[PDB]
Write a protein that binds this ligand. Structure first.
Ligand SMILES: *[C@@H]1O[C@H](CO)[C@@H](O)[C@H](O)[C@H]1NC(C)=O
Ligand SMILES: *[C@@H]1O[C@H](CO)[C@@H](O)[C@H](O)[C@H]1NC(C)=O
Ligand SMILES: *[C@@H]1O[C@H](CO)[C@@H](O)[C@H](O)[C@H]1NC(C)=O
Ligand SMILES: *[C@@H]1O[C@H](CO)[C@@H](O)[C@H](O)[C@H]1NC(C)=O
Ligand SMILES: *[C@@H]1O[C@H](CO)[C@@H](O)[C@H](O)[C@H]1NC(C)=O
Ligand SMILES: *[C@@H]1O[C@H](CO)[C@@H](O)[C@H](O)[C@H]1NC(C)=O
Ligand SMILES: *[C@@H]1O[C@H](CO)[C@@H](O)[C@H](O)[C@H]1NC(C)=O
Ligand SMILES: *[C@@H]1O[C@H](CO)[C@@H](O)[C@H](O)[C@H]1NC(C)=O
Length: 747
């Protein structure tokens, strides 16, 4: 689990074919080894050495588009004959400058500079892709960006000249001086829809696609349909069409933000993570706001009509004609989810694998079925801090069993398949994980490369064989399935034979095997933040809760995973009933309640929550007398059942909200406190108890002298304006006097 922590939040990341992993964090761009251990080299773009962000960037609402300083960062020409690869990096600084440079030692001279290539607005979108075009097949760079943002301050003037005001897509040339854009190599804009935010750019079937969506950077709300603009893969912009993408299924007003994109290459299927406006961070965060939608590139390629809806065309006016066709996703695959942030699709052993990154630090992968039907996603890796996953996942190019998860300011290299939990064949083959296969020589569920050391390929049994094709005992007893060796020995108890041979045992040269109608009203439901371990007692308040025999609660979190259907635990007062929810995965499940018979009554959202990890303990030491409200800062404290103080246990109260919570130190000594939730106990540092401090008094004004404890004003009560400092004793001054400290009251 090798991690690389930057200092400022990651702005971009790419992975070269053989030159390491480039990560653009703040003002500086680092290159690392594929193990993310040592920054082989580093470039400073703004000022030497000091690579702090010149200005402050507000990390906005997870649905809202982020902001960074490194707009473009993409390697190309790599794997050439003799020409070392190139890296094209474009920054916000210097009017959106962009430099080509040698892919490798970063501190080498930039070959060609260039200005106004990428958007110079830190929150403006930019997405680029290089390709081959021209009579001599030069390397061009198609860049779609938000050049003009209506936020120019008279100090510095980013927004390009009045001629290039409405420019969205430009076909730069990586050879010409300063990356020159032709006259016709640019795609104009319609000035009505607010701005456009481009998410991606990729090549498919001789064309470039730019998935975007209209957007109001001032307001923060999408102002139209997420769309895809399709351009001919040439030297001059040949606008070939534009098509809206309709992924608002399962949500009232629809999903109009495009959070991330990825083209599943060998499948010709685009895969996009859409979301609806989730208020301010998480206030309208519903169980169905985000949705992974899969589109057939053929349908987008066919349905995109050249209409002047968002981009100026030479044959119409802005929104004075047709409206763009709405392309419908592959219906059997759309995966709804409360918080999705990024997607990356690939194909392994002729099976689509879509890794997804959720807004709470989960990387979970789905494996599409036969007719591209999605399975319920397995959670691969979880970030302990639940930081929203950066919207791009990059697969390790040199070892195809890794992927580089970026989150906040930390990058890490995580395997793509958590197949160590499978202990048998069936566990390894019914899960239908394409990366994982059973291994006889090791008798373990593992990757391919980790067990193809014996040259007989059938040693590592994969899924394409089928789950039934592992060895088993057959009755006249024999071995069935696919074994590695053709020589074994059978022994039953007590006939034995050898080899393909004949309690039961089949032993091989490397392994072995052995076997011997009224109304119904719902006031509310509490709590609404159940920890992942479930909750034994969920109280639903309402009315007439006794006029029914079979009352059920149905929770649905993920449009692919099944539903949690439960019966009422013990029907209390006709106004109150009580349920018991089981363990699940971190999610925000919808809760309907269906009585004896009828439609579900959607009581409201109900969010499972990660276990409470304990960050810090504010005082961290108090007098053996105690009584000081120790404050604990952490995450997900609202779901805490209660607290334990183990040394003998001591029950103590709690006064808490989501992130932090306090409690009077009751020990009356190094004690360990533990959050208990649903019969489980997690640790929280250690509180130490020492003797009460000694005092000396003097004197409007009052001066006191005391010989570890971090005493502060609200801790002390002096009745007749405290200010203290250590001078060694330690003197504290305030302008029949009484002083209360914890539980000790004296003078
Ligand atoms: C780095 O540069 C930024 C420019 O805004 C400045 O605010 C910061 O103090 C500098 N830090 C150091 C260590 O030079
Ligand atoms: C990169 O080039 C500089 C320039 O001399 C050199 O000092 C440095 O050692 C080089 N680093 C690598 C990793 O090639
Ligand atoms: C920008 O372009 C000029 C023109 O060649 C060059 O001198 C300068 O080094 C370039 N800047 C960077 C950061 O490469
Ligand atoms: C939406 O965009 C328009 C044009 O950019 C702008 O005038 C308007 O102020 C934006 N919305 C809000 C609420 O400001
Ligand atoms: C590729 O583009 C051509 C150009 O018209 C089109 O006819 C063809 O259908 C496209 N390929 C696919 C798989 O749709
Ligand atoms: C019903 O009993 C529960 C406890 O079992 C209590 O909290 C609630 O207030 C009671 N409601 C009525 C209407 O009696
Ligand atoms: C010292 O006391 C202050 C007073 O609030 C507290 O915030 C802090 O956590 C204590 N411990 C330190 C500074 O190590
Ligand atoms: C301790 O502090 C918390 C918040 O910091 C507060 O809610 C709690 O009531 C305090 N306890 C005492 C005994 O002052």
């Amino acid at each position: 689990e090798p991690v690389w922590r930057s200092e400022q939040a990651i702005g971009a990341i790419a992975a070269s074919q053989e030159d390491g992993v480039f990560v653009a964090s703040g003002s500086c761009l680092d290159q690392l080894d594929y193990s993310l251990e040592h920054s082989l080299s580093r470039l400073y773009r703004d000022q030497a050495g000091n690579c702090t962000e010149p200005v402050s960037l507000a990390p906005p609402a997870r649905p809202r588009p982020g902001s960074s300083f490194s707009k473009l960062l993409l390697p190309y020409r790599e794997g050439a004959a003799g020409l070392g690869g190139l890296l094209l990096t474009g920054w916000t600084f210097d009017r959106g400058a962009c430099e080509v440079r040698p892919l490798g030692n970063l501190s080498r001279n930039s070959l060609r500079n260039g200005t106004e290539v990428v958007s110079c607005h830190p929150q403006g979108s930019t997405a680029g892709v290089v390709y081959r075009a021209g009579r001599n097949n030069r390397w061009y760079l198609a860049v779609a960006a938000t050049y003009v943002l209506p936020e120019p301050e008279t100090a510095s003037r980013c927004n390009p000249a009045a001629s290039d005001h409405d420019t969205a897509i430009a076909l730069k040339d990586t050879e010409g001086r300063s990356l020159a854009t032709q006259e016709l190599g640019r795609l104009k804009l319609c000035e009505g829809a607010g701005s456009l935010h481009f998410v991606d750019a990729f090549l498919w079937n001789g064309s470039i696609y730019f998935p975007y969506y209209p957007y109001n950077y001032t307001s923060g709300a999408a102002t139209g349909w997420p769309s895809m603009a399709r351009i001919a893969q040439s030297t001059e912009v040949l606008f070939q069409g534009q098509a809206s993408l309709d992924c608002g299924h399962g949500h009232p007003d629809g999903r109009r933000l495009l959070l991330s994109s990825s083209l599943v290459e060998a499948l010709d299927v685009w895969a996009g993570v859409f979301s609806a406006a989730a208020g301010e961070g998480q206030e309208r965060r519903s169980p169905t706001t985000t949705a992974l939608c899969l589109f057939r590139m053929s349908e987008i390629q066919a349905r995109a009509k050249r209409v002047s809806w968002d981009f100026k065309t030479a044959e119409s006016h802005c929104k004075e004609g047709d409206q763009p066709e709405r392309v419908q996703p592959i219906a059997s695959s759309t995966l709804i989810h409360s918080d999705l942030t990024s997607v990356y699709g690939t194909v392994v052993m002729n099976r689509t694998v879509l890794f997804l990154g959720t807004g709470d630090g989960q990387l979970l992968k789905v494996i599409l079925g036969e007719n591209l039907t999605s399975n319920c996603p397995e959670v691969i890796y979880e970030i302990k801090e639940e930081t929203p996953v950066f919207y791009k996942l990059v697969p390790d190019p040199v070892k195809n069993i890794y992927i580089y998860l970026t989150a906040g300011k930390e990058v890490r290299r995580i395997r793509v398949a958590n197949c160590n939990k499978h202990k048998s064949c069936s566990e390894c083959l019914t899960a239908t994980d394409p990366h994982c296969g059973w291994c006889h020589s090791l008798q373990r569920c593992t990757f391919q490369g980790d067990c193809v050391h014996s040259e007989n390929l059938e040693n590592w049994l994969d899924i394409s064989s089928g789950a039934k094709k592992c060895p088993k005992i057959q009755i006249t007893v024999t071995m069935v399935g696919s074994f590695s060796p053709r020589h074994s020995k059978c022994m039953v108890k007590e006939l034995c034979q050898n080899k393909c041979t004949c309690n039961v045992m089949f032993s091989f040269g490397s392994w072995n095997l052995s076997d011997r109608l009224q109304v119904f009203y719902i006031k509310s439901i509490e709590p609404q933040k159940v920890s992942t371990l479930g909750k034994s007692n969920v109280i639903v308040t309402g009315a007439n809760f006794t006029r029914a025999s079979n009352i059920t609660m149905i929770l649905k979190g993920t449009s692919t995973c099944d539903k949690d259907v439960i019966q009422v635990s013990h029907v209390l007062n006709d106004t109150h009933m009580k349920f018991s929810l089981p363990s699940s995965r971190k999610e925000m499940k919808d809760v309907c309640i269906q009585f004896d018979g009828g439609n579900c009554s959607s009581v409201g959202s109900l969010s499972y929550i990660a276990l409470p990890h304990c960050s810090l303990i504010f005082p961290a030491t108090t007098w053996i007398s105690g009584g000081q409200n120790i404050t604990m800062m952490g995450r997900n404290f609202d779901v805490i059942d209660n607290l334990i103080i183990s040394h003998g246990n001591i029950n103590v109260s709690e006064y808490c909200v989501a992130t932090y919570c306090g409690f009077l130190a009751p020990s009356l000594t190094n004690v360990t406190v533990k959050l208990r939730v649903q019969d489980t106990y997690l640790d929280c540092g250690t509180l130490q108890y020492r003797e009460d401090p000694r005092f000396t008094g003097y004197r409007t004004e009052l001066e006191v002298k005391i010989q570890n404890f971090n005493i502060s004003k609200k801790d002390i009560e002096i009745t007749l304006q405290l200010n203290c400092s250590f001078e060694n004793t330690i003197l504290c001054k305030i302008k029949k006097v009484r002083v209360k400290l914890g539980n000790l009251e004296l003078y």
